[PDB]
Structure formats: C-alpha cells, structure tokens
Amino acid sequence: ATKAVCVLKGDGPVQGIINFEQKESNGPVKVWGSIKGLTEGLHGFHVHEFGDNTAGCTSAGPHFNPLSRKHGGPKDEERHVGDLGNVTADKDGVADVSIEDSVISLSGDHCIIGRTLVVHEKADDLGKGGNEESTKTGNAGSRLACGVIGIAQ
Amino acid sequence: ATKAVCVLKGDGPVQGIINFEQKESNGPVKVWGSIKGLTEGLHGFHVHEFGDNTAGCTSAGPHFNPLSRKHGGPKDEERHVGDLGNVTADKDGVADVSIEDSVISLSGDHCIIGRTLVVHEKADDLGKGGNEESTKTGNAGSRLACGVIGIAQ
Ligand SMILES: [Cu+2]
Ligand SMILES: [Cu+2]
Ligand SMILES: [Zn+2]
Ligand SMILES: [Zn+2]
C-alpha cells in the first residue's frame, strides 16, 4: 500500500490535513481528513497540476488533467483526473472529508504525489454552470488553502 | 527535462525557494535557489524521507535512505540518498544554493518528489564527527525550515 498526506494552508483562516491511502496498484484511493475555517456549505476540492507554492495557491496551475478532458464531477467520464468534487463544511466551519476515487492514483500515470490539493471559496458546479468557466474549474472561485501532496509513513 | 520546486518555511525567519531540474533520465539533478534568514556560515541541507508536515519539519522523518547506508557528504561513496551536504549563508543571511547531484533523482528508486527538503541549524559534519550522531544526521542540529518537493512546470 502507499500513503500520502497534505497539509492545507492559505492567506486566511482555512487550514486542514488530508490523508490518502491506496492499497493496490490502480486501486481506489481513500481521501480523508478535516478542514476548518470554511463557510458553511459546499466547497470545490481538486488536485491541481503543480506542486508549486512559490506564489501561494496560484502557482499550482490548473486542474490535473493528463487526459486533456473538460471539467466535470467525480462521477462523470468527462472530468479532469483532479476533479474530486465538493467537500461539505458544517455550521462550525469544519469539513470532515471522506471520499474514495479511482481516477486519481498514488502511483503510475494518474499519480498525484508532488501535486497540489486545493480547497475553494465556492461550490464546484460539476460542469453544469452554463459558462465557459464551468467546463474548466466548475466556477469554484478562489483558492482558500492548498498544500503539496507528500509521501506518508 | 523533469522539474521540481520546494518552498521552505519554518517556525522562524528562514524562508526559501529551491528548484530542481533533471534533463536526462537517471542523470544529474541541478538544485538551485536562495534561502534567507539564516545565520552566516554552513547549514546542513538534506532530503528527508516523508513529505509530511503535519507536525512541522519533525514529521518529515530521517534522511531519505533507501539503500540503508550511513550518513556522509554528497561526494562520499557511503551516504544517504538525501545527503546534499551544506549550503552557505553570507553576512546578510542569504544562501544562494547551487548543487549538482546524481544520487538523488526526479524519477525511479531514488525519486525525491513528494519528500521533504530541510535546511538545518548547524553545519553538517559530513559523517566525520566521531560519534554515532555524525553517522545519522551529521550533527546538523535543528530543522529551521522545510517544504515538500513538488512537480513544477
Ligand atoms: Cu480547483
Ligand atoms: Cu537533515
Ligand atoms: Zn477540473
Ligand atoms: Zn544523511
């Protein structure tokens, strides 16, 4: 099995820790952890291409998309590898994250180690927003916090 | 060429950006950038095992050491893969780093993407300190700043 972890930080109050676990090659990756400081409600949650934080969350680039597809929800065939949808923050601003995805990977072609996880200002519209931006980012807006995905013990 | 980048931060004023570039498969990796906020003189500079910053630089673990060897300098036959020796800060506290190394790699068994780069409190004695600690860490002391190594554009 392979394990990874990500510490999310930004310019505001949003911070979190997200874990990744993959038991087998090409198997599902469990993504779980907790993010605090969020507004109540849905927040876009994606793996962006670069593990580059030199200029903050902005230098992580766009969504991880080695297949050159359009943006969608995690359950869509047409989606970016990094499209993990939304996470939900409760009334106290805490998002308990628990997702399983088989499009991302911790090894191989869809590997996300060394890339950046980002949690967003707004909900990801899953490509259903009717504008050009919807099929790029889901209109999820600004990057509240991010971190580089690292190898875990 | 494969490229990586690491933004170093810690609890104090030490901050920097270090770039990695490997033009050829299994070839030399250029490591360069700048670190500021350091006291003048030599500071240990290593790739540590885990890209885990949940407990600060402490959770990065020990030096990356897939071959189970003792600590040395980068030019030593006996060294950890993560042993990049020292960087030197000038009177203004700035270290302009430029190192070329062929033991680390940005792919394969010795891949360092997703691991942690650390800059230390003291000089790395390169394994010549005459005690057990020298053969583990080079006596470089505290971890002043660190960051996870990520894929760069
Ligand atoms: Cu995003
Ligand atoms: Cu070290
Ligand atoms: Zn997307
Ligand atoms: Zn070492």
Curated annotation (Swiss-Prot), chains A, B:
Record has Nucleus as a keyword: yes
Gene Ontology CC, one term: nucleoplasm
Role summary: Destroys radicals which are normally produced within the cells and which are toxic to biological systems.
Gene name for this UniProt entry: SOD1
Effect caused by changing residue 85 to R: In ALS1; ubiquitinated by RNF19A; interferes with zinc-binding; ubiquitinated by MARCHF5; leading to the degradation of mitochondrial SOD1
Effect listed in the UniProt record for changing residue 83 to A: Loss of zinc binding and enhanced tendency to form aggregates
Pathology noted in the entry: Amyotrophic lateral sclerosis 1: A neurodegenerative disorder affecting upper motor neurons in the brain and lower motor neurons in the brain stem and spinal cord, resulting in fatal paralysis. Sensory abnormalities are absent. The pathologic hallmarks of the disease include pallor of the corticospinal tract due to loss of motor neurons, presence of ubiquitin-positive inclusions within surviving motor neurons, and deposition of pathologic aggregates. The etiology of amyotrophic lateral sclerosis is likely to be multifactorial, involving both genetic and environmental factors.
Modified residue annotations for N-acetylalanine: 1
Binding-site positions, Cu cation: 46, 48, 63, 120
Catalytic activity: 2 superoxide + 2 H(+) = H2O2 + O2
Cofactor binding: number and manner: Binds 1 copper ion per subunit.
Organism: Homo sapiens (Human)
Positions of Zn(2+) binding: 63, 71, 80, 83
Result for mutant: residue 122 to A: Decreased succinylation
Phosphoserine modifications at: 98, 102, 105, 107
Keyword Calcium: no
Similarity-based family: Belongs to the Cu-Zn superoxide dismutase family.
Name of the molecule in the record: Superoxide dismutase [Cu-Zn]
